[PDB]
């Protein structure tokens, strides 16, 4: 979670990120997971590369990414971590699948390379 501009990257920031952030199921992903306050002892044992929308947000603002694929990977790491750590049927998983569907949807309208 450290921070430090193509047509695709602009789209990811102005359209994709914005769309997920304003969604009601995004609050659990707006900040890095705090294993102590959430009492999740095993979280960082299981998750080696944590990720959240605020980190992505900040990386986009500070021109951290060199290409869109990097940013898209971060969005996917966020979802993957959720699915890996939590159990199917859990509320947060349902929320992540909803956010990912909206993500794939918006991504499909992103301008094509070259």
């Amino acid at each position: 979670y450290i921070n430090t501009l193509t047509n695709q990257l602009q789209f990811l920031q102005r359209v994709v990120l914005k769309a997920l952030w304003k969604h009601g199921f995004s609050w659990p992903f707006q900040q890095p997971v705090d294993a102590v306050k959430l009492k999740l002892p095993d979280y960082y044992t299981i998750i080696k590369t944590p990720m959240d929308l605020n980190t992505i947000k900040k990386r986009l603002e500070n021109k951290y990414y060199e290409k869109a694929s990097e940013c898209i990977e971060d969005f996917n790491t966020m979802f993957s971590n959720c699915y890996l750590y939590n159990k199917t049927g859990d509320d947060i998983v349902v929320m992540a699948q909803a956010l990912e569907k909206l993500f794939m949807q918006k991504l499909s309208q992103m301008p094509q390379e070259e």
Binding site: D90, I92, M95
Partner: peptide, 9 residues
């Protein structure tokens, strides 16, 4: 697990 998140309100 993280518990419920209010789904099904």
């Amino acid at each position: 697990g993280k518990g419920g998140k209010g789904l099904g309100k």
